Amino acid sequence: TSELRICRIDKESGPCTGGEELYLLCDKVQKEDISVRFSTASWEGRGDFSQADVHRQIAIVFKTPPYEDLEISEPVTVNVQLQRLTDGECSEPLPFTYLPR
Amino acid sequence: TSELRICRIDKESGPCTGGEELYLLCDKVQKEDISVRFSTASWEGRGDFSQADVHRQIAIVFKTPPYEDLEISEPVTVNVQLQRLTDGECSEPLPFTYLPR
């Protein structure tokens, strides 16, 4: 109830040794009343995190624009950033590399 | 200013043909005054999304627990879910598969 829902987990696999840092996207939860449970029909395990590790974020779903040159033979890593429409203010850039066909 | 900051992009690469659905995590933005800019020193492109595509989410950073059997020779995909400490209520499960050493 209260709708505990996980939207996704950045990684779908990892070493059985554990201790691997991951992150999951979910709907509203109470950081003082939430935990992560890994399990099978006969085993149970918990993710290691604190309240400081529960971040309120915004997620934007979008389709990439086609690159200027659809005939590139070599990868081309461009910049990706947030930009405000009103003032045209940008955020720092993050890389994204386009791959040839 | 107002601190436009991107935390990450699920994919770091993709076809130069574009039209690839992605998502990025960032800090507070105004969905009616925000856009995504792809660019080089001489080229500019925009991500395709609407206001409906800007979601307020929670992200939890955590380390995975080690699996019960560290000697598995075959992958073992267990369940991962949110669980409330107070009532022990769980969310639907998402799969995560442990890999042998």
UniProtKB/Swiss-Prot annotation, chains A, B:
Expressed in intestine, thymus and spleen. Undetectable in liver, bome marrow, kidney and testis. It comes from the Eukaryota. Phosphorylation at 'Thr-103' and 'Ser-573' is followed by proteasomal degradation. It is found in: Nucleus; Cytoplasm, Cytoskeleton, Microtubule organizing center, Centrosome. Changing residue 91 to A/E: Strongly reduces transcriptional activity and interaction with NFKB1/p50 and NFKB2/p52. Component of the NF-kappa-B RelB-p50 complex. Component of the NF-kappa-B RelB-p52 complex. Self-associates; the interaction seems to be transient and may prevent degradation allowing for heterodimer formation p50 or p52. Interacts with NFKB1/p50, NFKB2/p52 and NFKB2/p100. Interacts with NFKBID. Interacts with BMAL1 and the interaction is enhanced in the presence of CLOCK. NF-kappa-B is a pleiotropic transcription factor which is present in almost all cell types and is involved in many biological processed such as inflammation, immunity, differentiation, cell growth, tumorigenesis and apoptosis. NF-kappa-B is a homo- or heterodimeric complex formed by the Rel-like domain-containing proteins RELA/p65, RELB, NFKB1/p105, NFKB1/p50, REL and NFKB2/p52. The dimers bind at kappa-B sites in the DNA of their target genes and the individual dimers have distinct preferences for different kappa-B sites that they can bind with distinguishable affinity and specificity. Both N- and C-terminal domains are required for transcriptional activation. This is Transcription factor RelB. It comes from Mus musculus (Mouse). The gene is Relb.
